[PDB]
Design a protein around this ligand. Structure first.
Ligand SMILES: OC[C@H]1O[C@@H](OC[C@H]2O[C@H](O)[C@H](O)[C@@H](O)[C@@H]2O)[C@H](O)[C@@H](O)[C@@H]1O
Ligand SMILES: OC[C@H]1O[C@@H](O)[C@H](O)[C@@H](O)[C@@H]1O
Ligand SMILES: OC[C@H]1O[C@@H](O)[C@H](O)[C@@H](O)[C@@H]1O
Ligand SMILES: OC[C@H]1O[C@@H](O)[C@H](O)[C@@H](O)[C@@H]1O
Ligand SMILES: OC[C@H]1O[C@H](O)[C@H](O)[C@@H](O)[C@@H]1O
Ligand SMILES: [Mg+2]
Ligand SMILES: [Mg+2]
Lengths: 724, 724
């Protein structure tokens, strides 16, 4: 409907209707929910919610199904005075019912299209079940794998995260201005604004601190990218940003988000984060929490009652302008309007059961393909992999049969529909003997059984990993290791003298030196999702060729953290020259390098890259165009991820030794050759200076071209002269 | 001499003379040295230093003795045109030849007078050997035990570090305006400006990043307090501060140091830190390193050649003002003048041999007292300690006979003058049997010998520890554990069925949980210095009663770092009333609490504390007077550390749950009672807001009074009304 009628609606609302519009509740707080209705009475009572609140609430979070949505919207619209429908929002993080790999795994694909397709399918299914908005993408830069939420991020690189964040928004939303017409797409909500992944000691919800320059340089760029790509909502972070909880941080949300980033959509709090500013010690009570959060521009309070119980009195007493309330309501109404809810409050569902669009075979094939793009081959000594389909396999370990392969943040998918490693393996390999072990134990009985199976077969697929519950939100591990019984199992298996592949399932970087050294191959599957078993079986048989690269460094040990490729040089770098000398930047007990670096992964193919002649000089403002010719020189078809880095050798700020500025995943048949070309704009050479200005300075840059952050060729370009 | 004559000197020096005055060299680069003359040739060659440079250099660093000094000074004055004597600087960190406990142990004393006396004796002796300046105190806040240099700090608390810093300045310098007459006092040099102990991942020299607010709040106050108390010099830090190497950080050194802190003495570089700005990637070559460091106001280049090889070109080409050089040179001459060097270049030594003032018995007694103040009793089950003088002791481990107990940053002290554990114990205990073991090994033959000594004896003193080379500068450990052999030794000893006291020697917090569980008593001696085994024997026997408290938290495990008492609350604090809820700030695998908290230490005595009735309300700017009555209620004379903390419950910035604001160690005979009073000025209730203003806000504060950061009674004070 027309903008004018949207405006009119706001004019017509009472003050109480306006306040309620800024409240979001679980489905079972509303009349006509078809699930958990026994909870309704007591919680309404605990939260001191009346019908006058629930009949005017702005939004539903976490509806269980189309029929939950429909019953709630129907009952709600019966009693709503002006007919403003509810907006329904959900956590669709890496799939709805067809579960794709965890976002950290998606990061490892280095494949924009893989990520878009993931998001497209997620929206196809989520819309089919009544959801209008997804709390995705999560764009928090991560350097600390102790934090359970690394699984939701695409990793340690701001550029990769930006690029995949855009892909995700494009997949969920399609053309953002046609969300009223395209009812299989949904609104995206960027999260968590901002810097949440810098949680101190990887402890959930803990303190975040960094200089403002760093915040701009590395922590804000992906949120910005996704916002500039049309992301419709943004969500607050639980953490302080420089001393002030993000939810009430006016500078952060008014000056930066709404001001500099020109975001004009709904700002939703993370769960309870409006009330939680009290806990943080920056509000004395719910009245202050409400006032400060409204001041900061938060439109929608998620499952707490500060606004609902406090705004009226604040406005009447002149401590808050009703104008700020009107701006929030308008933002909420426009989102509803963008989603087409004023013409159709059931968003396509009403005469049209879309059950059939959920968990199709086509969709499953897409999740499988994503899993195969995303896995990372870390070790393959003497071409153990791929296995011949006649290979006789001992399949041992906690991940041999565990159905827990869908990943954390899997709110709607069901393990009943997943494919476990055994089932997947038996579809490919004729001879499989299985010995399941527990996640945290290794008994003498297990050892006996494991030895019998290994003696019978030719190769060992040792399937290890994490329960998903050991990560995700409030899954913080102080030590980034598997249960010790699993490292023991790997030691034991190695003594039986048969070749061993370790297939590892997990949500975070782990200490894997001991695994790499106890096995001949190591394949990192992360949590691939619904098709986990077949993803595993196709990579192992070579039906698919591993092509993933690490989007986050794998530390030598927990104590090395944070370790990350785009690090500063220091005043005393360790060189190949000065190595062994005491007075340089080093540890006494480990190397400086992570165990596996950013951009690293193996293939069953072999590849050859050559960069075309580059200019020696460039003007300021001028682009560098990089041409790379890549050949597959093997008999095996595969993909390689070409990566281009830039270094700023000397600057007014100490700059990282490398930064990713372009990448493209290239498919080549055996002997096939291609040429890809990259443009590094003058923005790629620029950075934030000590006055917070975004600047390009003349001087030397290095350009690195290759297939990891460490396997590269290096060129020099001197920028100076005049400005384009 | 009179200031005009000092200004006359600046006016008469040639440009080359002024440049060279800003250079500092090792002693053997000068004619007249009496040690290491074989290094002189090649190093002059490598550094391209001529006679014209060395005959006009400003300063000597690390003279080897009074003779080295006299020879160098005397030859230098023969040839120096205007008669400007050399200033001699050295690292006197926790003692000269009488070695006192490492500064981190001195933090655990909580005793300002111990710290002043340590500095006083250090100056007595160092001046006796011809040193004019010491590179102490080290005032870097530390929260990360991986970093080797925690040994040089007094710990994780700004207030403690501020107070002991002033004590140290006071002890080295006495009345600063009389350093020209008090020739047994010497100048102090605060280091390292600024924030060096925040090195990322505990790695030597690594990146530091925090917000400007946080820098002011926690990282700057100790440097500030030492400077306000009159510290004559300041030294730059190796690390970046918000992206810019401290050495060439104009804002830091001109605006904050010289501007806000009003510091008008000599700014000396860390070792090589001027040239190293090149490696940091913020200067392209020595000419730039020279220009930027001089712009930032560094007066004295430590052992690199940027200034001497480049300043003439920079001044001649007018890229740098000669006035900046004249003010550096005037600062250098003012220091020399302040030390009385223009009346007496030999600073009291020329016809006065002061060997007699070195390593006196009185000084050894002071070092022993300091050791027994600083040690921390961590466990003492069933009153194992103190031992009877007739207890039969098996003394086992790598620290049983080891002479390495002087500590890191011991540049002049000698192991042969130190007292080891065995020697200390045999002065007190009639029956000791000793089995020495290696630091990193546990052999079968060791176990047999340990078993034999233990079977014979009644109790075991298990002496474990680090070698001092495993910390100090560029002694970073990713895992903060002893060698595994030592844990294995503790495990083994425990099986022998005799009571065990572990005496631990070390330069950092370590993972001691396994040691606490493997023994009946655990005594943290850190490294006590010259009197190490007498410190150890007096504490174990009861002749002294342990009184030290941790000034740094002891983590559960490496992966809990950073963990510190003065932490923020977060939005989702774990409370005793949400035990076991998933969605709160916690780890899955360890407690949130450190294994041992700040302010913790046991005693052979028992004390009771009673806080006098406090006001319920206070005005802004008003002090709070806190009166505490303490009684020793046991039969054993002993000392306790009364600690007062403050919390700002609600603020415009999220404030720590507690901060220490007063402390006093109280000595009490059996049954004796004392009252002490503390004034918490309004400065104690103030903080840096998001605008970087030092503010006091009206509102609620809590006052905690007790004997650790966790053993406290709590009171409430509402601040407001009018101001003063
Ligand atoms: O850390 C041991 C593992 O190292 C992998 O190589 C990764 C990366 O290491 C350096 O940066 C090299 O310069 C670069 O060429 C490498 O790609 C090995 O491939 C693993 O087998 C090792 O386990
Ligand atoms: O209680 C707070 C927490 O509640 C849970 O029910 C939600 O899923 C969490 O994501 C939320 O952060
Ligand atoms: O090479 C540089 C290093 O050499 C040693 O002689 C110094 O005492 C160190 O503190 C210095 O940082
Ligand atoms: O953290 C565990 C420790 O807590 C301390 O406060 C106790 O004094 C110790 O005996 C105990 O080992
Ligand atoms: O040895 C002189 C100085 O060398 C280095 O600059 C160290 O950082 C410093 O702590 C020491 O005082
Ligand atoms: Mg540059
Ligand atoms: Mg307050």
């Amino acid at each position: 409907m027309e903008q004018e009628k949207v405006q009119e609606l706001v004019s017509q609302m009472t003050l109480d209707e306006k306040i309620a519009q800024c409240l979001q509740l679980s489905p079972f707080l509303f009349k006509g929910t078809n699930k958990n209705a026994e909870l309704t009475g007591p919680l309404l009572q605990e939260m001191k919610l009346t019908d006058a609140h629930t009949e005017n609430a702005g939004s539903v979070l976490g509806s269980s199904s189309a029929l939950d949505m429909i019953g709630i919207q129907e009952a709600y619209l019966k009693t709503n005075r002006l007919g403003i429908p509810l907006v329904f929002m959900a956590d669709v993080i890496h799939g709805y019912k067809t579960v794709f790999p965890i976002p950290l795994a998606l990061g490892c694909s280095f494949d924009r299209e893989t990520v878009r397709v993931m998001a497209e399918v997620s929206a196809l299914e989520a819309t089919a079940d009544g959801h209008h908005v997804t709390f995705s993408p999560m764009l928090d830069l991560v350097r600390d794998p102790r934090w359970g939420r690394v699984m939701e991020s695409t990793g340690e690189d701001p550029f990769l995260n930006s690029e995949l964040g855009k892909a995700m928004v494009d997949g969920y939303q399609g053309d953002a201005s046609k969300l009223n017409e395209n009812l299989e797409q949904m609104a995206a909500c960027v999260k968590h604004f901002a810097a949440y992944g810098a949680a101190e000691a990887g402890l959930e919800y803990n303190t975040v601190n960094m200089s403002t320059r760093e915040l701009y340089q590395n922590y804000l760029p992906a949120y910005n990218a996704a916002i500039q790509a049309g992301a419709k909502l943004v969500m607050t972070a639980f953490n302080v940003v420089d001393g002030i909880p993000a939810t009430m941080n006016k500078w952060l949300n008014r000056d930066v988000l709404r001001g500099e980033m020109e975001f004009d959509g709904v700002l939703i709090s993370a769960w309870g984060a409006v009330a939680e500013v009290i806990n943080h010690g920056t509000a004395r009570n719910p009245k202050e929490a409400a006032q400060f959060s409204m001041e900061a521009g938060v439109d929608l309070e998620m499952m707490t009652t500060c606004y609902i119980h406090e705004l009226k009195g604040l406005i009447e007493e002149g401590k808050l302008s009703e104008n700020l309330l009107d701006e929030a309501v308008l933002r909420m109404l426009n989102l509803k309007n963008d989603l087409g809810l004023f013409e159709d409050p059931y968003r396509g569902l009403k005469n049209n059961d879309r059950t059939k669009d959920i968990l199709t075979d086509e969709s499953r094939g897409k999740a499988r393909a994503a899993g195969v793009e995303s896995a990372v081959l870390l070790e393959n000594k003497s071409r153990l992999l791929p296995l011949a389909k006649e290979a006789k396999i001992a399949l041992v370990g906690p991940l041999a049969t565990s159905p827990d392969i869908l990943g954390g943040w899997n709110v709607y998918g069901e393990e009943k529909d997943g494919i476990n490693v055994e089932t997947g393996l038996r579809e490919v390999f004729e001879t499989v003997e299985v010995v399941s072990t527990e996640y945290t134990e290794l008994s003498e009985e297990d050892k006996v059984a494991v030895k019998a199976a290994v003696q019978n077969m030719d190769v060992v697929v040792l399937a290890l990993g994490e329960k998903n519950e050991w990560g995700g939100e409030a899954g913080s591990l102080a030590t980034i290791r598997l249960p010790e019984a699993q490292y023991q199992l790997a030691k034991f298996v190695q003594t039986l003298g048969k070749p061993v592949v370790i297939t590892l399932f997990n949500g975070r970087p782990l200490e894997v030196k001991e695994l790499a050294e106890s096995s001949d191959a190591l394949l990192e599957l992360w949590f691939p999702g619904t098709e986990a078993g077949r993803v595993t079986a196709d990579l192992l048989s070579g039906a698919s060729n591993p092509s993933g690269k690490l989007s986050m460094s794998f530390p030598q040990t927990t104590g090395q953290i944070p370790v990350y490729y785009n690090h500063l040089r220091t005043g005393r770098p360790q060189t190949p020259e000065n190595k062994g000398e005491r007075y340089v930047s080093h540890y006494l007990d480990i190397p400086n390098e992570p165990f596996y670096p950013f951009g690293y992964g193996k293939s069953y193919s072999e590849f050859e890259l050559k960069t075309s002649s580059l200019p020696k000089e460039l003007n300021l403002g001028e682009s560098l165009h990089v041409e790379v010719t890549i050949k597959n020189i093997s008999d095996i078809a595969g993909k390689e991820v070409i990566q281009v880095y830039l270094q700023d050798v000397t600057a007014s700020i100490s700059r990282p030794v490398k930064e990713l500025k372009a990448f493209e995943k290239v498919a080549l048949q055996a002997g096939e050759e291609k040429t890809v070309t990259f443009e590094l704009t003058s923005e790629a050479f620029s950075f934030y200076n000590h006055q917070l200005e975004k600047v390009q300075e003349p001087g030397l840059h290095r350009v690195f071209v290759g297939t990891s952050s460490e396997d590269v060729d290096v060129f020099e370009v001197e920028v100076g002269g005049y400005v384009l």
